[PDB]
């Protein structure tokens, strides 16, 4: 401390120097799935109700058979199917002994609640983003790989990527079914995806021989109308998803049971305080359409 | 009119399709707009990825922006439908009157 | 400095025993950050003689 | 990054270069949509044939 160099007066040893108590924060994501999709109040564990299938054709007269004389078809004699919400449960604790904060500096109590919460907010974001079907809800980006939602190919998977405006109008094409008339979209794009976008040379280029005055005040995140939304939580570059759409007009609800309880225990514990927090949110579609990614396989 | 393009195959929808169209329906038929014209899903979709004079950026529109494409294509308005069958040999666009 | 990411876990749908399926999270583990700090000096001279 | 210009002489600095060297760094990065740029003086008057 004082060491390196001491020279010639004093010299003593090493912890001679005030240190100081200040916290400070880097990097975040922000936060766009766990407060975007409504919230569904229910009083049980799982939720049913019926909803009706389409046509329905009735058949023309054959130009003879006008009379009695049968034969006229008829609709559908099977119909409303149900539809089942689930709801899945998680929960966390962390627990702190006196014997490292006696020794230490008074201060490790409000903080430990702050990074509880925290984790257990990134833990629930990446579970809506990325997740399976076992145990955790399925995710958002393997949403659309059982209605046969993905294409093959967007960008080039490193070797001269480019991710021209033409690619979401193709997106849209893939997706075709049944609302086009903008129901109030939502789409997610990533990191670097995000940064590519501004090399462009397509649409909302460097000149005004393509794009009208948007830009404002220079490269700001605008695309076919909509704004854009990015985010971190993405895997590493690869053959995964980099851009998600989903339609958002009936659906993308979470049911939950309660809000955030956070509380403590120590008795009849020994010695220790110990943090409890619980949850029940969770992400389901009632039908399956309307969601679609890219993906950027390889080219 | 047979053929533009090739069933998305590797060319498709171009803005010049409505210019012949109107060429060859009825001769006398004009008098401005009052024709309509209806356009199938599909093909109002490739039609969106434009590189043609009626774009959503600047290059030949009214200023639309806001929102995704604007009945404006030589006058007429576009009617959407989701009803055409096999895309291959059959018909992705009608125009059609009701002035008579 | 505090630290980074902090990850929980869900449950196992049937287990109630208590039993939390927690995992364990990592209470108050971070790292120390220091400033070390250089001197910058000159000297110059000048004779009576001019 | 590597590369765009190589030497001056026949291929020049434009704009489209620092599009693709933030590509790391900040306009998102840790949250913040500000930056400070710097530039070479004999750099500044090669940015002109663009």
Partial sequence: AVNQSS?????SESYETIFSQRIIRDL???????????????????????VEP?????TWVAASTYGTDTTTGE?????????????????????????TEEDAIFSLLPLLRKRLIEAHAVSI?????????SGKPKGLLTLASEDSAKVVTEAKADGSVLVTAKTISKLRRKLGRHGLKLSKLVLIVSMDAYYDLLEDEE?????????????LQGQVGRIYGLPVVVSEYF?????????????????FVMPRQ???????????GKQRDAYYVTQRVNLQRYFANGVVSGTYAAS
Avoid: C
């Fill in 258 to 268: 309660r809000a955030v309880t956070v509380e403590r225990e120590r008795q009849a």
């Fill in 75 to 99: 609709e559908v004699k099977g119909a409303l199917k149900e539809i089942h919400f689930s709801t899945y449960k998680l929960a966390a604790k962390s627990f702190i002994t006196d014997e």
């Fill in 28 to 50: 975040q994501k922000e936060l766009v799935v766990g407060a975007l999709f409504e919230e569904l109040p229910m009083s049980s564990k799982i939720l049913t109700m019926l």
């Fill in 125 to 133: 974001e990446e579970a809506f983003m990325t997740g399976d079907g």
């Fill in 7 to 11: 020279s010639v007066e004093v010299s």
């Fill in 235 to 251: 895997p590493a570059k690869a053959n995964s998803a980099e851009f998600a759409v989903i339609v958002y007009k009936d659906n």
């Fill in 203 to 215: 649409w909302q280029d460097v000149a005004q021989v393509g794009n009208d005055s948007v830009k």
């Fill in 54 to 58: 389409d046509a329905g054709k009735a």
